[PDB]
Symmetry: C2
Subunit: 61 residues, 2 copies
């Protein structure tokens, strides 16, 4: 019965992985689309800098 | 038979490691979209290119 409990937790975690990678690819696809649109204007350069920022933002507006 | 529960346990640990990395990558990409959205809102200057980027931001995936 311990097999039963751990197989259930593995399948719960695997479903969370699949939902996260679907949401990640959804956002990543838009970012690739926007880079193609940008591919010189200072506003578009700021957008390109956002695409290639090495860390998540934190600044309060 | 005894190693069966240990194998399911190990596969659960591998999936839990993927979650923590996927959440950071998800927040990383979503944060970029929020920043691009903010730049488009602040810019206004009747630019068709920025309007195309806004339409990409809010386009829906008929599959999601």
């Amino acid at each position: 019965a311990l097999a039963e409990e751990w197989k259930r937790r593995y399948e719960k975690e695997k479903e969370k992985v699949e939902d996260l990678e679907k949401e990640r690819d959804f956002y990543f696809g838009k970012l690739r689309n926007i880079e193609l649109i940008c591919q010189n204007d200072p506003v578009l350069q700021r957008i390109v800098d956002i695409l290639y920022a090495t860390d998540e933002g934190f600044v309060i507006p």
